[PDB]
Amino acid sequence: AKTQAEINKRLDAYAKGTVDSPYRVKKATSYDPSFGVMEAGAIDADGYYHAQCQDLITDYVLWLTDNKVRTWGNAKDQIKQSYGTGFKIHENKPSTVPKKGWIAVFTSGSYEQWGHIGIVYDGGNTSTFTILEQNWNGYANKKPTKRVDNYYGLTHFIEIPVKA
Ligand SMILES: [Ca+2]
Ligand code: NA
Ligand SMILES: [Zn+2]
């Protein structure tokens, strides 16, 4: 398991394009004519579809679990599987406010078909929070980027284990 300080450092490194990941693009990379060229810093964990939202999560969960747990499926399928001990799935209730490093999962409305997914960067309040995500633009080309979200479509949070 990882400490909060280790988690926090890794989130900043995602956003800066310096994360210690073998799935981080070093030089602008392209293979799928439907998507934009992946900039340095993008995370592509599967070698399909350039840098999608779930690619970030695949990398993060591999790091959290010392490469023991590889996610399968699309963003929306993450709430149908378990990442193991100390990972907990929470329904997003109007009461619910997440914690830095938790995983935010969008499965309703405009996100229903594939889901969307990202990492909680700032837990915020009941109105907004800051997410760190890939592919909110649909072009699958940018590195992980921060965005303010209003909980629209957001159905679940995945709590991750934190080492004291
Ligand atoms: Ca990919
Ligand atoms: Na909420
Ligand atoms: Zn997606």
Author numbering: 2 to 165
Task: List passages from the publication reporting this PDB structure.
LysK, an endolysin from staphylococcal phage K, contains an N-terminal cysteine-histidine dependent amido-hydrolase/peptidase domain (CHAPK), a central amidase domain and a C-terminal SH3b cell wall-binding domain. CHAPK cleaves bacterial peptidoglycan between the tetra-peptide stem and the penta-glycine bridge. The structure has the papain-type fold with a long loop between the two amino-terminal alpha-helices. The structure suggests the location of the active site near a hydrophobic groove, with Cys54, His117 and Glu134 forming the catalytic triad.
